Amino acid sequence: YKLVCYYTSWSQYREGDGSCFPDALDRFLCTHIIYSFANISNDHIDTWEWNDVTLYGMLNTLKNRNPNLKTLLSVGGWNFGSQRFSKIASNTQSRRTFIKSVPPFLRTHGFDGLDLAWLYPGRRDKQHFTTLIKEMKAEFIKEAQPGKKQLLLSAALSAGKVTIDSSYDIAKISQHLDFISIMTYDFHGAWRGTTGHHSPLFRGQEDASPDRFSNTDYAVGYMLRLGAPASKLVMGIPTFGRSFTLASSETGVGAPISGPGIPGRFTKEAGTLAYYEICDFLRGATVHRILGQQVPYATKGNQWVGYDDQESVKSKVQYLKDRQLAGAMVWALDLDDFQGSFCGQDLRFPLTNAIKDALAAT
Ligand SMILES: CC(=O)N[C@@H]1[C@@H](O)[C@H](O[C@@H]2O[C@H](CO)[C@@H](O[C@@H]3O[C@H](CO)[C@@H](O[C@@H]4O[C@H](CO)[C@@H](O[C@@H]5O[C@H](CO)[C@@H](O[C@@H]6O[C@H](CO)[C@@H](O)[C@H](O)[C@H]6NC(C)=O)[C@H](O)[C@H]5NC(C)=O)[C@H](O)[C@H]4NC(C)=O)[C@H](O)[C@H]3NC(C)=O)[C@H](O)[C@H]2NC(C)=O)[C@@H](CO)O[C@H]1O
Ligand SMILES: *[C@@H]1O[C@H](CO)[C@@H](O[C@H]2O[C@H](CO)[C@@H](O)[C@H](O)[C@H]2NC(C)=O)[C@H](O)[C@H]1NC(C)=O
């Protein structure tokens, strides 16, 4: 199986023990590590953080004791916005310049391939997205033309049906991508007014669900139905949780909320908590497994958070294995307990290791 793990350039900036640098990554944990994110300047792929070059190096060194470990540079990302990509992918000159700039940049910097994270092609961008993926792949095949190990091409795709219908021609792009990472988390926005798990495996209680597609099973099944080979499908498993501030004494699923949860000490972003912040939260908290969704949530005082733990990610791995998918994608390594100092044992990367062990298991 594949175990594609994301590392974010901005985690280095986290306070104290939150600070994560590539050399803190276990070179043996994943089969692929994706560095996020690279920028696009003047239609060329470029660096983003002042010291990316230093960090790309730390990351790639990890390949020294581990020859078959693969690294990729992801371009795009949520904040990057879809505007820049569109303007590039629709203009024929911009597309060629961008495409042409990539192989040399990855070779110059030691990367094994490119990950596209265009979030998200508009309804008007569907075709352009397919064209971008097609030509980019041509260029890679053309670059390895002699005897090079061909560069890899992947794309992180939305797990949202609406988005999937307006943005992607799944059958076409699957022909050119080495693998697709479906982003199966971030399903329950706070705008809803109630508690809900952002990454449930299944729909669960029929009348306690908004719709039938804001869950992993549906996203997976749907991509399969749309023509994505199972062998090329990597399933997203989050290592962070989505939090809410409760509005009453009710603490179950669908409980009224007043807004996103209180910001975590290290990630400092309302509505979000890294697994290691969750572990701290769990002390004095009460945990509940959601019967129909196979995932837990925790509540304490006026706070509620839906996340994944050792038990739930193993179930998710069990699920992908049964569907015969290519493996799992993890967002994100720096959100897991990379220190191994916040949760139970002194084990580093508890969630990702659980995923790894499960993918190899029995
Ligand atoms: C069913 C359906 O369709 N539902 C919709 C749903 O999809 C939508 O929600 C969105 O979903 C997508 C998945 O499809 C999410 O994106 C993917 O998933 C992860 C996890 O969410 C994304 O991770 C976030 O990525 C952004 C950057 O792209 C991160 O932003 C960072 O924020 C920090 C702090 O705020 C910044 O740090 C600063 O850095 C500077 C220098 O770098 C430093 O000097 C500062 O000191 C430092 N601190 C501060 C505070 O300034 C950092 O710069 C910035 N990064 C960048 C490059 O801008 C954010 O923190 C990540 N969050 C998590 C969690 O890790 C990721 O982008 C993407 N993964 C991949 C592979 O592409 C998307 O995030 C999510 N949106 C939300 C709510 O976050 C929703 C909402 O639209 O709609 C539904 O309909
Ligand atoms: C990513 O690339 C863009 C250009 O494509 C960079 O440009 C932005 O920032 C510049 C410096 O402050 C501004 O002068 C530009 O106007 C602005 N974008 C435009 C319209 O060109 C951007 O800095 C790069 N991102 C980072 C942080 O490296």
From Swiss-Prot:
Stored PROSITE patterns: GH18_2
Q: Which residues form the GH18 domain?
A: 1-362
**Positions of disulphide bridges:** 5-30, 279-343
Chain intervals for the UniProt region annotation (Important for AKT1 activation and IL8 production):
303-317
Q: In which tissues is it expressed?
A: Present in activated macrophages, articular chondrocytes, synovial cells as well as in liver. Very low or undetectable expression in non-inflammatory colon. Undetectable in muscle tissues, lung, pancreas, mononuclear cells, or fibroblasts.
Q: Name one Pfam family in it.
A: Glyco_hydro_18
Q: Name its cellular compartments.
A: Secreted, Extracellular space; Cytoplasm; Cytoplasm, Perinuclear region; Endoplasmic reticulum
State the superkingdom: Eukaryota
Descriptive protein name: Chitinase-3-like protein 1
Q: What's the gene?
A: CHI3L1
